[PDB]
């Protein structure tokens, strides 16, 4: 936890392949774990992002959950901080409501003096004109909850949740998200008990950058214990 004291730069790299459409997203910003604040900008290196931003907000930001503000009595329960120095691997399976599935693999680690997230995404079983492929999703992300539970057999932490995505027509799409973690380092995992992380997301565009801005301000707080 001593590493996160103060302000920490954050760098994110994602390389997704959605039904043959390959997109690379590079993101930079800062995070204050003490206040549980995360200010990032994920610019898509490619000309355009073939999927709505909110779909990949979970893949990009929630991969970095080590900046979450864990209460004092819950400080020991932060598996991400405990395993951060050597990094960790995070595999997400995301089932949309009858609109295919994302599979993503991410590696989180310190390089030099900056956090780095190397992410590879692949979406399959997608239907054209759908909620995701149709771009009907509005550009906004709602506050959500992520449930976290240990697993000694895999020596890793598992997460479950449902994400609500708004749509232009007014429909709300429920996407199931399942997360599996593997500690890269051989040091003690310090895995916690059941606990839920509440996330608040506000999205914005910068005026200066002509390219996609994807400016994101997040506040994540752990609770349940």
């Amino acid at each position: 936890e001593e590493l996160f004291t103060g302000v920490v730069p954050i760098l994110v790299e994602l390389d997704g392949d959605v039904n043959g459409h390959k997109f690379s997203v590079r993101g930079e910003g800062e995070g204050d774990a003490t206040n549980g604040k995360l200010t990032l900008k994920f610019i898509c290196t490619t000309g355009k992002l073939p999927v709505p931003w909110p779909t990949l907000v979970t893949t990009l930001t929630y991969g970095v959950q080590c900046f979450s503000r864990y209460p004092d009595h819950m400080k020991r329960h932060d598996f991400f901080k405990s395993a951060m120095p050597e990094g960790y691997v995070q595999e997400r399976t995301i089932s949309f409501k009858d609109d295919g599935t994302y599979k993503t693999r991410a590696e989180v680690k310190f390089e030099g003096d900056t956090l780095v997230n190397r992410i590879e995404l692949k979406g399959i079983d997608f239907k054209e004109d759908g909620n995701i492929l149709g771009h009907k999703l509005e550009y906004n992300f709602n506050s959500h909850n992520v449930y976290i539970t240990a697993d000694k057999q895999k020596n890793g932490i598992k997460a479950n949740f449902k994400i609500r995505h708004n749509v232009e027509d007014g429909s709300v799409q429920l996407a199931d998200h399942y997360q599996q973690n593997t500690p890269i380092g051989d040091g003690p995992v310090l895995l916690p008990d059941n606990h839920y992380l509440s996330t608040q997301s506000v999205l914005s565009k910068d005026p200066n950058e002509k390219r996609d801005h994807m400016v994101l301000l997040e506040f994540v707080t752990a609770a349940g214990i």
Partner: nanobody
Framework: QVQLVENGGACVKPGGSLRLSCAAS????????MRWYRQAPGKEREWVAG????????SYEDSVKGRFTISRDDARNTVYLQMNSLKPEDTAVYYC????????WGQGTQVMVS
């Protein structure tokens, strides 16, 4: 800054009708879409109705399809939701959501058919 107040939640027998209302202060209703979420006691929150910012298109779910009549009023700065004939499946409470910025949850009103 931005706040929501709901009203119209009253006990109604099966086959009756009530007019749920959601007023908002801190933003113009026409510029932002509004959604209604249904939460049964102890169950996961779900979505029942949604009205876009323009207001010319509205969306419902299969369970309540053909029963609700979502409307908006800019002069009153309030959205309204009808129920047509109530059924026991509508025993859950209703919450009013509007994502003008960050994420806002209305206080909500209770609706049980009983």
């Amino acid at each position: 800054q931005v706040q929501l107040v709901e009203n119209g939640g009253a006990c109604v027998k099966p086959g009756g009708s009530l007019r749920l209302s959601c007023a908002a202060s801190g933003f113009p209703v026409n510029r932002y879409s509004m959604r209604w979420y249904r939460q049964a006691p102890g169950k996961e929150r779900e979505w029942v109705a949604g009205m876009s910012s323009a207001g010319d298109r509205s969306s419902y779910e299969d369970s309540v399809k053909g029963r609700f009549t979502i409307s908006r009023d800019d002069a009153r700065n309030t959205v309204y939701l009808q129920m047509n004939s109530l059924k026991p499946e509508d025993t859950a409470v209703y919450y009013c959501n509007v994502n003008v910025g960050f994420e806002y949850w209305g206080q909500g009103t209770q609706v049980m058919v009983s």
